[PDB]
């Protein structure tokens, strides 16, 4: 939540939350929280569920790209940057991030692609920077006819509207493989008589 630098839509890092007690069902730290839709798990049943491996997918997308992160839809991000499986077990959390990432000089730090040879695999990591060879024209490091650079940056602004604002989305996807659980929920009901 209080990170000073996030990753891109394709070069996102993965951290494992384990060996510690988590405080679920209470995570509202910012005011708006436009997206708190969970799949398969109730929002009020997160504290009484133990986990062993929890990955955090942190990526920055536009406002119209928030709805594209859903099983069964197709868009520009749900097919070439990041896509959730059909039987997704987790929750999607997004908020407004136009305050601390406001610079009118230019935002060329975050990168994202829009073209690939095929569809994405569930939980796929792509960092290649080869030339997009689509037609029957060989590319040998040429910028122009039939050869381009697939990696491009964003154009975020403090006045990016209302349905296109940068939504920093953190996916709380858990993995359950009948393993010994270590992440326990909040257990505080002590009253001795």
């Amino acid at each position: 939540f209080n990170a000073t630098r996030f990753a891109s839509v394709y070069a996102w890092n993965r951290k494992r939350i384990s060996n510690c007690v988590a405080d679920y069902s209470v995570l509202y730290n910012l005011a708006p929280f436009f997206t708190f839709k969970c799949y398969g798990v109730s929002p009020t049943k997160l504290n009484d569920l133990c986990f062993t491996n929890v990955y955090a997918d942190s990526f920055v997308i536009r406002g119209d790209e928030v709805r594209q992160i859903a099983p069964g839809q197709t868009g520009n991000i749900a097919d070439y940057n990041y896509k959730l499986p059909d039987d997704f077990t987790g929750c999607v959390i997004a908020w407004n991030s136009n305050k601390l990432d406001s610079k009118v000089s230019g935002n060329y730090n975050y990168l994202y692609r829009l073209f690939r040879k095929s569809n994405l695999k569930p939980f796929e990591r792509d960092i290649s920077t080869e030339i997009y060879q689509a037609g029957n024209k060989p590319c040998n490091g040429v910028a122009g006819f039939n050869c381009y650079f697939p990696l491009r940056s964003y154009s975020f602004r403090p006045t990016y509207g209302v349905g296109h604002q940068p939504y920093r989305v953190v996916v709380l996807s858990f993995e359950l493989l009948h393993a010994p659980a270590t992440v326990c929920g909040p257990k505080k009901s002590t009253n001795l008589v």
């Binding site: 037609g135 122009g144 602004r157 006045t159 509207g161 209302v162 349905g163």
Partner: protein, 591 residues
């Protein structure tokens, strides 16, 4: 092939064009909020960088083929990107084309003609409109014409020659055909639309527009004889300086002179906007509540934070130019000198239409972030102010009580000025457009320029000059849109577009009342009818745009007469003892 390869070039272009266009528009908005040197230094470099990037991206797009592309969704985008223009010739041509445009702009801005004498904007129409003296306008017409005609004729002829030379580089007939190319439509056999046949459509529309204007121009001639007896012809034309303006396109001040019934004025809500507690903020609140009531989304949270609605008196340089600026990136803001007047209410309802239009096509890329043509851009703003101008809307706002007695003469004198301010400039527009279409291709040589200009002015508009002018003058180049590069065909099409959209929204709501007083208040049916129209933007042409509006794919003059229905019969019943027509032989200088 390059089927999916062109998908990458345009997405790489627009990705950074969205960034740089906003960098330029923010500097432009900052220069408009205060006119200082530090803001201009940032705006000039941004505009130059954007113009250089556009050419750097368009210089390599010409190598790609266009006829082998199959998907029309990108064919509509690629044809709009190759329109470079001055990129074919060298830089010496562009330098000498701009060094004369700046010179003529500085000359026209500093127009000072005396022998009580002022600049261009200072005391321009205040003498033409307010003053009713004949000798006060006698000089104000002749000197204003002769100070900018003979001093701009040798500079404008070379400019027209350069405009014709620019047509051969991009394979065009003339410069006038370049502005007609924006009304382009491609697709199937029934979706194509040629850019040269527009003259025929304009003529077909004007052939039906003329019978509406004949009685309107004949009735205003009978009553003007009570002030100018020896200056108004009985069965001829009218002088050009007796039209309330130097060109006769805005007959706003002629309403008190051509009032149908002076025993009761029109509607008045200026006094009610002061004692009820109205401010500049609550007007936009009610306007947006009226806009959302038809099924439109809400506004941006920053629209109430960054938009300069109230005029600050803390040292800001205000230009006071009401225009909905589309800065990009989904940013919606309004720079307007807002007050509690009705004149500021009309433009406040006009700009909200442009705002809700720009909100619709924000999903498509920067290249398609435009209308289907030049006539759909500023045409959605007038229908909202027309629907809000009804007395029932003002009674539903909460200003006047529900016991208001609306009479027929009120609607008559309202439609009179609503026509004189809208359809009064249609002949003036058509005359200059046909003149430009004739003189740009090479149909009318330079040896019969002013003679043909005056012949067309007498035949089409029906205005006779008070003194004879030779061909050494350059009168038609004295207009704001004629001197510099400004298209004018859009204003002739928007007048039909607004009356078509109003009728299309009124018929879908099942309203069997008066068309000129039809309102879209609390109509969820027309909202979905308008959203699918404004959502396509530049992705779909006007052919596919009008089919979801009314169904037809051609210009319709039927709404032009179906709007002013109580006015046509009124002028017919009041012209029972008047001569309908015009005379091309009568002239005030015929001594």
């Amino acid at each position: 092939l390059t089927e999916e390869n062109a998908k990458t070039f345009l997405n790489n272009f627009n990705q950074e064009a969205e960034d740089l266009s906003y960098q330029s528009s923010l500097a432009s908005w900052n220069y408009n909020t205060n006119i200082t040197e530090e803001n201009a230094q940032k705006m000039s470099e941004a505009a130059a960088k954007w113009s250089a990037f556009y050419e750097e991206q368009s210089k390599t797009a010409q190598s790609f083929s266009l006829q082998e592309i199959q998907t029309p969704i990108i064919k509509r985008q690629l044809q709009a990107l190759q329109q470079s223009g001055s990129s074919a010739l060298s830089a010496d041509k562009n330098k000498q084309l701009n060094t004369i445009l700046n010179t003529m702009s500085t000359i026209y801005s500093t127009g000072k003609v005396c022998n009580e004498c002022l600049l261009l904007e200072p005391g321009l129409d205040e003498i033409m409109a307010t003053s009713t003296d004949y000798n006060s306008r006698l000089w104000a017409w002749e000197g204003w014409r002769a100070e900018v005609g003979k001093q701009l004729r040798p500079l404008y002829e070379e400019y027209v020659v350069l405009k014709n030379e620019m047509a051969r580089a991009n394979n065009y007939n003339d410069y006038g055909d370049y502005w007609r190319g924006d009304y382009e439509a491609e697709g199937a056999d029934g979706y194509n639309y040629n850019r040269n046949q527009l003259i025929e459509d304009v003529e077909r529309t004007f052939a039906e527009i003329k019978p509406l204007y004949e009685h309107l121009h004949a009735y205003v001639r009978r009553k003007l004889m009570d002030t100018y007896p020896s200056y108004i012809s009985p069965t001829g034309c009218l002088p050009a300086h007796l039209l309330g303006d130097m060109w006769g396109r805005f007959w706003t001040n002629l309403y008190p002179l051509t009032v149908p019934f002076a025993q009761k004025p029109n509607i008045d809500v200026t006094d009610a906007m002061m004692n009820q507690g109205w401010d500049a903020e609550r007007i936009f609140q009610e306007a947006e509540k009226f806009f959302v009531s038809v099924g439109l989304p809400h506004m941006t949270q920053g629209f109430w934070a960054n938009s300069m609605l109230t005029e600050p008196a803390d040292g800001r340089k205000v230009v006071c130019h009401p225009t909905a600026w589309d800065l990009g990136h989904g940013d919606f803001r309004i720079k307007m000198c807002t007050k509690v007047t009705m004149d500021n209410f009309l433009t406040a309802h006009h700009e909200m239409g442009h705002i809700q239009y720009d909100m619709a096509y924000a999903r498509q890329p920067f290249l398609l972030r435009n209308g289907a043509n030049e006539g759909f851009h500023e045409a959605v703003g007038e229908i909202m102010s027309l629907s809000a101008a009804t007395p029932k809307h003002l009674k539903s706002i909460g200003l006047l009580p529900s016991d208001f007695q609306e009479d027929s003469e009120t609607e008559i004198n309202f439609l009179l000025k609503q026509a004189l301010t809208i359809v009064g400039t249609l002949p003036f527009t058509y005359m200059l457009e046909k003149w430009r279409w004739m003189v740009f291709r090479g149909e009318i040589p330079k040896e019969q320029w002013m003679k043909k200009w005056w012949e067309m002015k007498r035949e089409i508009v029906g205005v006779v000059e008070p003194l004879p002018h030779d061909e050494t003058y350059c009168d038609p180049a004295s207009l704001f849109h004629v001197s510099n590069d400004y298209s004018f065909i859009r204003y002739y099409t928007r007048t039909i577009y607004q009356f078509q959209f109003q009728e299309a929204l009124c018929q879908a709501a099942k309203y069997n009342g008066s068309l000129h007083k039809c309102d879209i208040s609390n109509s969820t049916e027309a909202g979905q009818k308008l959203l699918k129209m404004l959502s396509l933007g530049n992705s779909e042409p006007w052919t596919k745009a009008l089919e979801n509006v009314v169904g037809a794919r051609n210009m319709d003059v039927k709404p032009l007469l179906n709007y002013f229905q109580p006015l046509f019969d009124w002028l017919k019943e009041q012209n029972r003892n008047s001569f309908v027509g015009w005379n091309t032989e009568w002239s005030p200088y015929a001594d």
